[PDB]
Amino acid sequence: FPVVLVINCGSSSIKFSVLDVATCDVLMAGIADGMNTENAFLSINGDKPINLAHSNYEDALKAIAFELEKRDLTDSVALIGHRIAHGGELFTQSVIITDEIIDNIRRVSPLAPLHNYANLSGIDAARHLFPAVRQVAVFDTSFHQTLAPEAYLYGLPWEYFSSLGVRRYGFHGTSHRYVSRRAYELLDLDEKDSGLIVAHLGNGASICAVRNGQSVDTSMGMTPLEGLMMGTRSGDVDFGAMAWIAKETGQTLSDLERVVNKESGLLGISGLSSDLRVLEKAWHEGHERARLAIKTFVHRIARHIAGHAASLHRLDGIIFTGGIGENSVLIRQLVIEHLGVLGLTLDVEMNKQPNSHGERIISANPSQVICAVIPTNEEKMIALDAIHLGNVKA
Amino acid sequence: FPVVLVINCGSSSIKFSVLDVATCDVLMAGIADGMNTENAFLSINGDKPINLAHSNYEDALKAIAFELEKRDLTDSVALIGHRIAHGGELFTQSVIITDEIIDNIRRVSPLAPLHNYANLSGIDAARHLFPAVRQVAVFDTSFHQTLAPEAYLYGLPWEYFSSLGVRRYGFHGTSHRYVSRRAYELLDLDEKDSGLIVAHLGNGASICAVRNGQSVDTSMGMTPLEGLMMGTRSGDVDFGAMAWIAKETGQTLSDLERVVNKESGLLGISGLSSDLRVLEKAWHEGHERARLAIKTFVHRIARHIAGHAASLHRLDGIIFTGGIGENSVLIRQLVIEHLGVLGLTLDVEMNKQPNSHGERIISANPSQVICAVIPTNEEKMIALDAIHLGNVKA
Ligand SMILES: Nc1ncnc2c1ncn2[C@@H]1O[C@H](COP(=O)(O)OP(=O)(O)NP(=O)(O)O)[C@@H](O)[C@H]1O
Ligand SMILES: Nc1ncnc2c1ncn2[C@@H]1O[C@H](COP(=O)(O)OP(=O)(O)NP(=O)(O)O)[C@@H](O)[C@H]1O
């Protein structure tokens, strides 16, 4: 009974899951938090934050490796999937990890300093701990590599693109890829002739236009900071305004970069929390700035959803996914009502159902565009890619 | 036979026009260029760049005043219209200029340093030269003051808005206001129940959603730098990317601010020119980067046009205006074909007609949304406001 070990090595943690190759079901999940800190712990399924204070990425993965062995899993690990934050223009699909791939991931790391290096650390440790096991890399950016130049170019001088590689990349590619594949089935669409807009709404959020199975537009840019307003991220922001602020408060780009990434968005406007659940309650209670943060959030999502639709020849569906897209009955309705111009008609009873109802349609029949909720499963998408690559000869 | 003297005092020049109060026709136009420079000239209708080297804004306006007198116009000037770049949140409509208004324009000038002060200089000189004449101020931002908070707020921490006044303002308000008024007639729409998207495309470019006669969304932000990619302006740009570039080339916000405003857009990508006519020819000749600059330009316009439509309950029309919107047969068609998702159907023969055909429809009947070209006339809009205010008792 072979299993796949999926690893998401982040800047300060290591998320992992062990899925059955047969059913792709999760058999075990966990996370090593407080990495590189004098206090690092590992909580599997949440039964006991183990101890590994002052442990590097490989030690953390070693602890994890031992727990898999303590549960006689170590021997069924036939594949290992690595989530890679940024693949530059070098990766257009998932690959079997080799020395060449490592070199290439290293070449593009300057595009995502912190994140990519943590990804390499995780690969280095995984390679050390499971030498005879095939390993693959899944990049959050590859799905968006089908975008045309007109859609990925910035209006900056050409040199910045050709020399420094400044262009739109986009993220949540694995989710967008996974969710759109699922949509073809739920909506009974022909991939080769279809137009979908997927709204991945979580702490990080982005929109993606998938025309005939291909990504043709996405909201994040060279970095995860562009596009929609998010939990702590501002989203699109007039550069003139950022420049004006700097001269006004004497702050630097670093000062401002941190504010835009860690103190803005829902948190920044509400001055309460980045958690939608908290703000939804706050608004229900009469909090004015919570209502404003949510309204602004909803307004920007609708604006990008409509804008991205311009890259489609025909709009067949709008899919909501992610922690927010899958669970927020209110946000979904507000966004949808803010898109009445597109001819959307919501079925409230359907939209009211909790996420336990899985892949479901929430628009009424009279609706010109089908609306649905499709829970994302990036671990499964990664495992599926790994499984596919498991049949290759390298 | 009273006339209105319209003045656009810029950072380096003074554009002016004298319109007949009866027909609002232009009787005389001109421009004093090279202001504050050791070489300043004044070209009326283009018959003789006069001389006024080393002359301030008031001297330049004095030269202009003399030419009006030399043509016995000075005595028919019953009103003077001033174009104001930025009105902050203080101005929601055009006003009769008084000491209070001057004070208020001065209060918001920090929102547009260079520009607004030049505007005040022009008002100061006009007041000195025509004491007994009523004068009014028309702000490029007032039409957008109807935007809801959700549409004008940035995802930055609340303090920046409440304390520093950082929010979206938008520009081209006079054009958008004038053009949308004209659209109600051309399209036989009921202002009170309508949805229009106006695309002001010139060297500076912006989109605006007018719902039931009111502006509810616009593309420029706190400054003219946000939104569409323009002649020399980049348009929306991922702040993360700007931050990354800075650390990479060691440039400052000022360095980058200048590049985004003066070396980007059509000029930046084509590395040829900011003039569409030049690039259109370049592409026709096989220039690859010209074709890319134009395609990118077209792609971003379509994206914002569709996104802005989300702020409408129903899309009745899409209006093209400005130097580019009024004259570019190619760009109009490309944008429109890039919006097939909205059900637009173009009438090529109609779209082929030159601007001499004035306000005209360019979409075919089968089209779900009417498309048209409406030449903008900001001088006329200003004169009309002045005329209205001319009947008031102050
Ligand atoms: N029942 C719920 N109702 C409303 N919002 C919810 C609910 N459950 C989670 N959320 C919200 O959605 C967010 C978390 O989304 P999620 O996709 O799980 O996280 P994330 O993996 O850290 N995002 P990203 O890191 O870019 O992949 C929080 O803001 C939550 O408040
Ligand atoms: N016949 C034409 N065909 C294509 N493009 C044209 C034509 N005439 C003017 N343009 C373009 O449109 C631009 C000038 O637009 P216009 O609205 O007149 O200028 P502007 O007043 O300086 N813009 P703004 O300063 O923000 O109001 C140039 O890029 C021109 O190449």
Asked whether the CA dihedral A42, A109, A215, A346 is positive or negative, the reply is positive
- Resolution limit in angstroms? 2.3
- Count CB-CB contacts under 10 A for residue B1: 10
Cβ-contact A345, A318 below 8 angstroms: no
What residues pair up with B96 in beta bridges, in sequence order?
A: B136
For residue B166, the number of C-alpha atoms closer than 13 Å in the C-beta half-sphere is 23
Residue of B nearest to A222 (CA): B241
Tallying the residues shown for chain A, one arrives at: 394
Pick the closest to residue A127 from A151, A93, A102 (CA basis).
A102
Q: Nearest bound ligand to CA A294?
A: 1
Which amino acid, residue B309?
A
Tokens representing residue A183 in the block: 């949509």
Name residues 277-316 of chain A within 8 A of B (Cβ): 289, 292, 295-296, 298-300, 302-315
Determine contact: A318 vs chain B, CB below 8 A. Answer: no
The answer to whether B189 is annotated as binding is no
CA distance linking residue B316 with residue A209, whole number of Å: 25
CA distance linking residue B110 with residue B90, whole number of Å: 13
A202 ligand 1 Cβ < 6 A:
yes
Q: Do A340 and B158 touch (CB under 8 A)?
A: no
- Count CB-CB contacts under 10 A for residue B166: 24
CA distance linking residue B144 with residue B140, whole number of Å: 9
CA distance linking residue B142 with residue B127, whole number of Å: 23
- Count CB-CB contacts under 10 A for residue A285: 8
Pick the closest to residue B273 from B265, A308, A282 (CA basis).
B265
For residue B210, the number of C-alpha atoms closer than 13 Å in the C-beta half-sphere is 30
* Ligand 2 mutation pick, B8, B171, B228, B277, max ligand atoms within 8 A of CB: B277
A331: CA distance to ligand 1 center in Å? 12
CB-count burial class (<10 Å; 0-12, 13-18, 19+) for A315:
buried
What residues pair up with B84 in beta bridges, in sequence order?
A: B139
Q: Which residues contact residue A247 at a Cβ distance below 8 angstroms, ignoring those fewer than 6 apart?
A: B253
CA distance linking residue A318 with residue A312, whole number of Å: 12
The answer to whether B323 is annotated as binding is yes
Q: In A176-205, which positions are buried (b, 16+ CB within 10 angstroms) versus exposed (e)?
A: bbbbbebbbebbebeeeebbbbbbbbbbbb
B297: CA distance to ligand 2 center in Å? 14
CA distance linking residue A266 with residue A4, whole number of Å: 36
Cα–Cα–Cα angle for B109, B114, B116, rounded to 5 degrees: 40
Q: In A337-361, which positions are buried (b, 16+ CB within 10 angstroms) versus exposed (e)?
A: ebbebbebebbeebbeeeeeeebeb
Q: Do A304 and B307 touch (CB under 8 A)?
A: yes
Residue labelled with tokens 């400052």? B252
φ, ψ of residue A173 in degrees (nearest 5): -55, -40
Q: Which residues contact residue A154 at a Cβ distance below 8 angstroms, ignoring those fewer than 6 apart?
A: A160, A161, A166, A167, A168, A221, A222, B234, B237, B238, B241
CA distance linking residue B19 with residue B4, whole number of Å: 5
CB-count burial class (<10 Å; 0-12, 13-18, 19+) for B354:
exposed
CA distance linking residue B223 with residue B157, whole number of Å: 18
CB-count burial class (<10 Å; 0-12, 13-18, 19+) for A104:
middle
Tallying the residues shown for chain B, one arrives at: 394
Shortest distance between the Cα of A50 and any Cα of chain B, in A, equals: 36
Q: Do B310 and A305 touch (CB under 8 A)?
A: yes
If DSSP codes are grouped into helix, strand and coil, which group holds residue B220? coil
A20, A47, A99, A140: which one is catalytic?
Answer: A140
Three-state SS annotation for B271-324 = CCCCCHHHHHHHHHCCCHHHHHHHHHHHHHHHHHHHHHHCCCCCCCEEEEEHHH
Pick the closest to residue A300 from A376, A160, A199, A154 (CA basis).
A199
Q: Which residues contact residue A127 at a Cβ distance below 8 angstroms, ignoring those fewer than 6 apart?
A: A97, A135
What residues pair up with B16 in beta bridges, in sequence order?
A: B7, B30
Asked whether the CA dihedral A156, A158, A162, A168 is positive or negative, the reply is positive
Residue labelled with tokens 């219209």? B81
CA distance linking residue A156 with residue B26, whole number of Å: 39
Pick the closest to residue A77 from A123, A115, A32, A129 (CA basis).
A129
Which amino acid, residue A316?
D
What residues pair up with A29 in beta bridges, in sequence order?
A: A17
Pick the closest to residue A82 from A128, A118, A106 (CA basis).
A118
Tokens representing residue A316 in the block: 């067949």
Tokens representing residue A390 in the block: 């498991």
Determine contact: A166 vs chain B, CB below 8 A. Answer: yes
If DSSP codes are grouped into helix, strand and coil, which group holds residue B51? strand
Asked whether the CA dihedral A79, A84, A89, A90 is positive or negative, the reply is negative
What residues pair up with A13 in beta bridges, in sequence order?
A: A33
Name residues 224-243 of chain B within 8 A of A (Cβ): 224-226, 229-230, 233-243
Q: Provide, as residue numbers in chain A, all residues whose Cβ is less than 8 Å from the Cβ of B157.
A: 259, 263-264, 268-269, 271
- Count CB-CB contacts under 10 A for residue B312: 21
Shortest distance between the Cα of B282 and any Cα of chain A, in A, equals: 16
Residue labelled with tokens 């908070």? B149
CA distance linking residue A251 with residue B166, whole number of Å: 15
Comparing CB atoms, the residue among B245, B264, B310 nearest residue A338 is B310
Q: What distance, in Å, lies between the first and last C-alpha atoms of chain A? A: 23
Name the pairing type of β-strands A360-361 and A370-373. Answer: antiparallel
* Domains contained in chain A, CATH given: 1-188 (3.30.420.40), 189-394 (3.30.420.40)
Tokens representing residue B76 in the block: 């028919």
Cα–Cα–Cα angle for B289, B296, B370, rounded to 5 degrees: 135
- Order of all β-strands in the sheet with A317-321: A214-218, A205-211, A195-201, A317-321, A370-373, A360-361
Cβ-contact B79, B385 below 8 angstroms: no
Query: Which residue is closest in CA terms to ligand 2's atom 6?
Result: B324
In this structure, what is the dihedral angle of CA atoms B379, B59, B28, B230, given to the nearest 10 degrees?
-40
Q: What distance, in Å, lies between the first and last C-alpha atoms of chain B? A: 23
Cα–chain center distance at A17:
16
Cβ-contact B206, B148 below 8 angstroms: no
Residue labelled with tokens 């070098």? A90
Q: Nearest bound ligand to CA A325?
A: 1
Q: Provide, as residue numbers in chain B, all residues whose Cβ is less than 8 Å from the Cβ of A168.
A: 238
Residue labelled with tokens 């004068």? B135
CB-count burial class (<10 Å; 0-12, 13-18, 19+) for A76:
middle
Shortest distance between the Cα of B357 and any Cα of chain A, in A, equals: 29
B33, B59, B103, B140: which one is catalytic?
Answer: B140
Cβ-contact B59, B35 below 8 angstroms: no
B202: CA distance to ligand 2 center in Å? 4
CA distance linking residue A87 with residue A219, whole number of Å: 17
Q: Which residues contact residue B88 at a Cβ distance below 8 angstroms, ignoring those fewer than 6 apart?
A: B107, B108, B111, B141, B165, B169
Determine contact: A341 vs chain B, CB below 8 A. Answer: yes
CB-count burial class (<10 Å; 0-12, 13-18, 19+) for A311:
buried
B45: CA distance to ligand 1 center in Å? 62
CB-count burial class (<10 Å; 0-12, 13-18, 19+) for A54:
exposed
Cβ-contact A302, A339 below 8 angstroms: yes
B70: DSSP letter: T
Alpha carbon distances (Å) from B66 to A52, A208, B42, B280, B383: 86, 60, 12, 42, 21
Tokens representing residue A328 in the block: 């927020």
Please, which experimental method was used? X-ray
Three-state SS annotation for chain A = CCEEEEEEECCCEEEEEEEECCCCCEEEEEEEECCCCCCCEECCCCCCCEECCCCCHHHHHHHHHHHHHCCCCCCCEEEEEEEECCCCCCCCCCEECCHHHHHHHHHHHHHCHHHHHHHHHHHHHHHHHCCCCEEEEEECCHHHHHCCHHHHCCCCCHHHHHCCCCCCCCCCHHHHHHHHHHHHHHCCCECCECEEEEEEECCCEEEEEEECCEEEEECCCCCCCCCCCCCCCCCCCCHHHHHHHHHHHCCCHHHHHHHHHHCCHHHHHHCCCCCHHHHHHHHHCCCHHHHHHHHHHHHHHHHHHHHHHCCCCCCCEEEEEHHHHHHCHHHHHHHHHCCHHHCCCECHHHHHCCHHHCCEECECCCCCCEEEECCCCHHHHHHHHHHHHCCCCC
Cα–Cα–Cα angle for A281, A286, A292, rounded to 5 degrees: 85
CA distance linking residue B238 with residue B218, whole number of Å: 19
What residues pair up with A137 in beta bridges, in sequence order?
A: A82, A95
Residue of A nearest to B195 (CA): A341
Q: Do B268 and A158 touch (CB under 8 A)?
A: yes
Q: Which residues contact residue B349 at a Cβ distance below 8 angstroms, ignoring those fewer than 6 apart?
A: none
CA distance linking residue A38 with residue A54, whole number of Å: 5
Q: Is B47 a catalytic residue?
A: no
Cβ-contact A215, A143 below 8 angstroms: yes
Cβ-contact A216, A312 below 8 angstroms: yes
CB-count burial class (<10 Å; 0-12, 13-18, 19+) for B388:
exposed
φ, ψ of residue B224 in degrees (nearest 5): -70, 0
Pick the closest to residue A340 from A367, A315, A310 (CA basis).
A367
Shortest distance between the Cα of A323 and any Cα of chain B, in A, equals: 20
Determine contact: B222 vs chain A, CB below 8 A. Answer: yes
Cβ-contact A119, A105 below 8 angstroms: yes
Q: Which residues contact residue B327 at a Cβ distance below 8 angstroms, ignoring those fewer than 6 apart?
A: B354, B355
Pick the closest to residue B319 from B209, B219, B228, B157 (CA basis).
B209
* Ligand 1 mutation pick, A208, A277, A301, max ligand atoms within 8 A of CB: A277
CA distance linking residue A18 with residue A6, whole number of Å: 6
B202 ligand 2 Cβ < 6 A:
yes
The answer to whether B277 is annotated as binding is yes
Q: Which residues contact residue B229 at a Cβ distance below 8 angstroms, ignoring those fewer than 6 apart?
A: A155, B205, B235, B236, B264, B265, B266, B269, B296, B297, B300
Helix segments in B70-168, DSSP class H = 99-108, 113-129, 149-152, 158-162
Q: Do A222 and B233 touch (CB under 8 A)?
A: no
Pick the closest to residue B343 from A169, A97, A360, A341 (CA basis).
A341
CA distance linking residue A215 with residue A169, whole number of Å: 11
DSSP H/E element including B145: none
Q: Provide, as residue numbers in chain A, all residues whose Cβ is less than 8 Å from the Cβ of B155.
A: 229-230, 233-235, 237, 264-265, 268-269, 296, 300
Diameter of chain B measured on Cα atoms = 63
Q: In B265-279, which positions are buried (b, 16+ CB within 10 angstroms) versus exposed (e)?
A: bbbbbbebbbbbebb
Comparing CB atoms, the residue among A260, A263, A313 nearest residue B341 is A313
- Order of all β-strands in the sheet with B360-361: B214-218, B205-211, B195-201, B317-321, B370-373, B360-361
DSSP H/E element including B47: none
Q: Got the DSSP string for B338-393?
A: TTGGGT--B-HHHHHS-GGG-SEE-B-TT-SSEEEE----HHHHHHHHHHHHTT--
Cβ-contact B80, B386 below 8 angstroms: yes
CA distance linking residue A88 with residue A141, whole number of Å: 7
